[PDB]
């Protein structure tokens, strides 16, 4: 046997950044944002729910122990993978390497977008054409997309959880909620610890988490959707 | 009022025989199936399997047409057929046992046994193989099987050095030619495309999800998720 290339490949819409177009497709969903087309599978949802039970075969108990706050805490809730991707994108927009070559006006726009992705589930954010008309240039759009791909790429530098002191996670605080992204065998576990405000006003610690399949990000980390 | 992104190690982790490899049995489990072979426990997901069928039947949106065209020998071929990831893993593992780096780490008494296992995994779909005690020229220790497992882990590890299909001339496939049978393993975004071509010219293909092998790609044990 030997390595060989047989199936190798042969060698605008600015307002798309303000849209979050989710739509069901074969094997899951498609989400369009910017010039990215995300293909989200239904993978792991059944497993994730089952792992919150303590009546799992012994091989899964280590997993439940490692993520106690997620699996051995009944109060934590599982979110759909496309919501977890949305959260992941919100984090990417705040990447230090991305916001370093942006103009301040557009930087503040990116900030609004980031908050919209992290805190909301709405399909659109409305920003005044006055700010977009001077700050959202083709260059800034290009850089923004290049930055997100770059963040996806550095996520693949993460090692899957291991027993030999290797960085398996990325932690960040954004708009009053601790976000943790961990690489597992199935992809990236996206975990958010926030404070929920329930209407007398009552504040409580809340934990949500979802699983973004590796293929979702690998498609946009370096082609074809397969 | 917020912090910055930081790499974190917060989630750090703190007897074989002939009969253990002589079976290929699919066990029902949550989210798919479990296959036990040697000291390997394969978790095969029941997902990513519907997409291949749609791509074959052309029940897809137009964004997948370049994918159907790139793999025209798989999705645009009347004499192509899809096997479940359970059988695609079987083929893949069969090829693994034929790895040269694994072969040179064995002994002819054990090499002949491994070869029999390989042909059984590659050419058959039977759940068990019975090798007559006569054929065993030597005793088989647990250690010989252990280093065989290491060889398999190493083959998985080499498959992860493949790049996804690209346009930079980077290797994205492992080919192996046998007796009237060609086997190609291609790394896509969703995992590894395993196809087998025979003669007339028929082809059979399936998909092995990246998680199946990722779990067993490193020397360290780790955790199933």
């Amino acid at each position: 046997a030997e390595l060989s290339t047989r199936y190798n490949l042969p060698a605008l819409d600015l307002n798309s950044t303000a849209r979050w177009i989710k739509e069901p497709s074969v094997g899951g969903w498609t989400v369009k944002w910017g010039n990215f087309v995300f293909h989200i599978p239904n993978t792991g949802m059944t497993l994730l729910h089952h792992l919150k039970s303590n009546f799992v075969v012994p091989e899964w108990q280590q997993t439940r122990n490692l993520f106690s706050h997620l699996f051995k805490n009944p109060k934590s809730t599982i979110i759909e993978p496309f919501l977890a991707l949305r959260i992941l994108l919100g984090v990417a927009l705040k990447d230090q390497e991305l916001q370093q070559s942006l103009i301040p006006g557009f930087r503040s726009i990116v900030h609004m977008l980031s908050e919209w992705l992290l805190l909301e589930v709405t399909s659109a954010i409305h920003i005044s054409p006055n700010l977009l008309g001077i700050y959202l240039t083709s260059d800034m759009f290009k850089i923004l997309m290049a930055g997100v791909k770059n963040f996806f790429n550095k996520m693949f530098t993460l090692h899957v959880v291991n027993d030999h002191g290797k960085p398996s996670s990325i932690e960040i605080k954004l708009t009053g909620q601790q976000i943790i992204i961990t690489r597992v065998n199935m992809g990236f576990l996206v975990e958010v610890r926030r404070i929920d405000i329930e209407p007398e006003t009552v504040l409580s610690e809340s934990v949500v988490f979802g699983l973004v399949a590796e293929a979702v990000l690998r498609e946009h980390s370096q082609g074809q959707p397969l």
Side-chain angles (χ1 to χ4, degrees), chain A residues 46-140:
Chain A
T46 303
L47 180 63
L48 281 177
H49 282 88
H50 182 57
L51 293 175
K52 277 176 72 63
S53 173
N54 62 95
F55 304 103
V56 299
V57 301
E59 79 198 16
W60 291 111
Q61 291 285 21
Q62 183 180 17
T63 302
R64 302 190 67 245
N65 298 145
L66 184 60
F67 307 94
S68 302
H69 46 281
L70 301 186
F71 299 118
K72 302 173 67 171
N73 171 28
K75 268 190 173 300
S76 72
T77 65
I78 303 173
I79 57 179
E80 289 73 30
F82 54 77
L83 245 45
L85 175 67
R86 189 184 169 105
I87 291 180
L88 199 157
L89 275 178
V91 171
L93 267 53
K94 300 302 294 178
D95 196 57
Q96 63 283 332
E97 197 168 4
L98 171 55
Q99 297 176 316
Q100 141 270 10
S101 56
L102 303 180
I103 49 187
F106 180 66
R107 177 182 286 112
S108 71
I109 287 180
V110 171
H111 183 251
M112 283 180 280
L113 291 178
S114 184
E115 284 184 347
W116 162 62
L117 292 165
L118 292 172
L119 301 178
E120 311 173 52
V121 297
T122 61
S123 58
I125 176 69
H126 298 296
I127 306 179
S128 176
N130 288 14
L131 300 182
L132 298 175
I134 54 187
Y135 295 139
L136 181 50
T137 57
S138 72
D139 273 17
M140 289 296 140

Side-chain angles (χ1 to χ4, degrees), chain A residues 5-197 199-208:
Chain A
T5 69
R6 180 151 214 167
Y7 293 103
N8 268 10
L9 296 170
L12 38 80
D13 208 335
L14 293 176
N15 37 321
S16 54
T17 66
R19 297 177 247 165
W20 181 260
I21 315 296
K22 190 205 72 179
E23 45 177 339
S25 71
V26 180
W29 310 269
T30 285
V31 178
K32 295 184 179 184
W33 174 89
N35 59 352
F36 291 97
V37 181
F38 295 109
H39 302 80
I40 319 302
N42 273 302
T43 306
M45 294 307 293
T46 303
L47 180 63
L48 281 177
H49 282 88
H50 182 57
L51 293 175
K52 277 176 72 63
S53 173
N54 62 95
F55 304 103
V56 299
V57 301
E59 79 198 16
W60 291 111
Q61 291 285 21
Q62 183 180 17
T63 302
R64 302 190 67 245
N65 298 145
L66 184 60
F67 307 94
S68 302
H69 46 281
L70 301 186
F71 299 118
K72 302 173 67 171
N73 171 28
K75 268 190 173 300
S76 72
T77 65
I78 303 173
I79 57 179
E80 289 73 30
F82 54 77
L83 245 45
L85 175 67
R86 189 184 169 105
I87 291 180
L88 199 157
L89 275 178
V91 171
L93 267 53
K94 300 302 294 178
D95 196 57
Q96 63 283 332
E97 197 168 4
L98 171 55
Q99 297 176 316
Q100 141 270 10
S101 56
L102 303 180
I103 49 187
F106 180 66
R107 177 182 286 112
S108 71
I109 287 180
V110 171
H111 183 251
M112 283 180 280
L113 291 178
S114 184
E115 284 184 347
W116 162 62
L117 292 165
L118 292 172
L119 301 178
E120 311 173 52
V121 297
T122 61
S123 58
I125 176 69
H126 298 296
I127 306 179
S128 176
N130 288 14
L131 300 182
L132 298 175
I134 54 187
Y135 295 139
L136 181 50
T137 57
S138 72
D139 273 17
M140 289 296 140
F141 178 88
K142 227 85 74 59
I143 293 180
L144 180 61
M145 304 302 127
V148 173
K149 290 174 70 66
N150 176 255
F151 180 84
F152 286 161
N153 177 84
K154 66 206 310 181
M155 287 184 55
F156 283 97
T157 71
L158 288 177
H159 287 248
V160 185
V161 295
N162 54 92
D163 64 338
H164 45 282
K166 285 179 166 51
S168 58
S169 296
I170 301 171
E171 307 189 11
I172 192 172
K173 280 81 169 179
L174 287 176
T175 68
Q177 54 188 60
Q178 196 190 43
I179 305 178
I180 291 116
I181 303 169
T182 303
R183 183 174 192 172
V184 288
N185 290 326
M186 294 187 54
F188 299 94
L189 205 57
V190 176
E191 160 189 2
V192 179
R193 301 175 180 180
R194 63 165 69 109
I195 293 182
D196 271 11
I197 305 181
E200 182 177 22
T201 298
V202 46
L203 309 198
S204 184
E205 181 71 25
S206 172
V207 172
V208 298

